[PDB]
Write a protein that binds this ligand. Structure first.
Ligand SMILES: NC[C@H]1O[C@H](O[C@H]2[C@H](O)[C@@H](O[C@H]3O[C@H](CO)[C@@H](O)[C@H](N)[C@H]3O)[C@H](N)C[C@@H]2N)[C@H](O)[C@@H](O)[C@@H]1O
Ligand SMILES: CC(C)(C)n1[nH+]c(-c2ccc(Cl)cc2)c2c(N)ncnc21
Ligand SMILES: [Cl-]
Ligand code: NA
Length: 266
């Protein structure tokens, strides 16, 4: 049953949301989206605008729905507006004020221990979300298939491997990684890119996380591995402290190595 109706309309287009901001172009970002910072507008918060074209549009779309879901549970940027056209995605979010964990670690070297404890506690909060809440699958089976396609499509950044794999052909990382399998299933809600760049401190407090496009159910080491790796630029004591504060007695080196190798593909 269908009735014939009149012509309705929408109330908000992207143009009005952008009035009176200064524009800046930041670096690429997780999956290569163009990133704009919107600032310098009186009585209006700093915003971020992400624009993905083609394949990258899917990544931006993926980030949009995860922002939408996860913000019910954790402090995340707020979606102001999102647009999807056939070859394009635009995602406008409110900025989380402050500096990245990386920035604060460099500016307050003596605060490393407090920074790691905060990071560990925040990660525990994230991991405590019961998986029954989460509609996203990011498990190793799913990620391995993503990794395979990126390799096969010629997309892996072989110049950006960790030092222990510096100069390895992508195919060698792929083969060697498969020797660490299988290992015991573990499932928690994960961030997916839990680096020092993606946690935001303001006035000495960890107040939020960003770049949530890889969020979903996966092994907790997906997040522990990536952060552990980042802390490796700073000190082995901070690396160790992460696991200690988190509450793990004997870091599973197999799972650790696997998730570090897996992230080489992304
Ligand atoms: N390609 C896009 C991705 O590029 C980076 O990810 C890469 C890491 O940076 C690499 O590691 C290097 O940088 C770390 C700090 O990030 C250092 O601790 C480490 N010792 C360094 O070797 C790691 N080998 C691969 C991983 N794909 C971004 O983080 C990620 O968001 C983005 O999507
Ligand atoms: C990339 C994106 C849009 C997720 N992004 N990036 C940043 C960011 C903040 C500080 C620095 Cl120094 C660099 C980036 C950021 C933010 N604060 N709030 C929300 N999204 C942010
Ligand atoms: Cl793009
Ligand atoms: Na929230």
């Amino acid at each position: 049953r269908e009735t014939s109706c009149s012509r309705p309309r929408l109330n908000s287009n992207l143009d009005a949301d952008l009035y009176g901001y200064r524009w800046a172009r930041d670096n690429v970002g997780q999956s290569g989206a163009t990133i704009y910072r919107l600032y310098g507008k009186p009585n209006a918060p700093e915003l971020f605008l992400k624009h993905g074209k083609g394949s990258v549009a899917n990544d931006v779309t993926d980030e949009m729905v995860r922002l939408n879901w996860l913000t019910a549970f954790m402090p995340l940027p707020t979606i102001k507006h999102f647009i999807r056209t056939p070859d394009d995605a635009w995602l406008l979010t409110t900025a989380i004020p402050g500096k990245t964990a990386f920035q604060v670690l460099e500016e307050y070297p003596d605060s490393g221990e407090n920074i790691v404890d905060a990071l560990a506690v925040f990660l525990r909060r994230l991991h405590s979300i019961p998986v029954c809440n989460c509609p996203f699958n990011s498990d190793r089976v799913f990620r391995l298939a993503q990794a395979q396609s990126r390799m096969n499509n010629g997309l892996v950044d072989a110049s950006d491997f960790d030092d222990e794999r510096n100069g390895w052909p992508v195919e060698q990382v792929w083969k060697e990684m498969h020797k660490l399998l299988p290992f015991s299933p573990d499932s928690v809600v994960t961030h997916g890119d839990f680096s020092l760049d993606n946690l935001i401190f303001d006035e000495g407090k960890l107040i939020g996380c960003i770049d949530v496009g890889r969020v979903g159910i996966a092994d907790r080491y997906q997040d522990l591995a990536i952060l552990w790796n980042c802390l490796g630029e700073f000190s082995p004591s901070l690396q160790k402290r992460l696991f200690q504060k988190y509450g793990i007695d004997n870091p599973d080196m197999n799972k650790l190595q696997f998730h570090l190798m897996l992230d080489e593909f992304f």
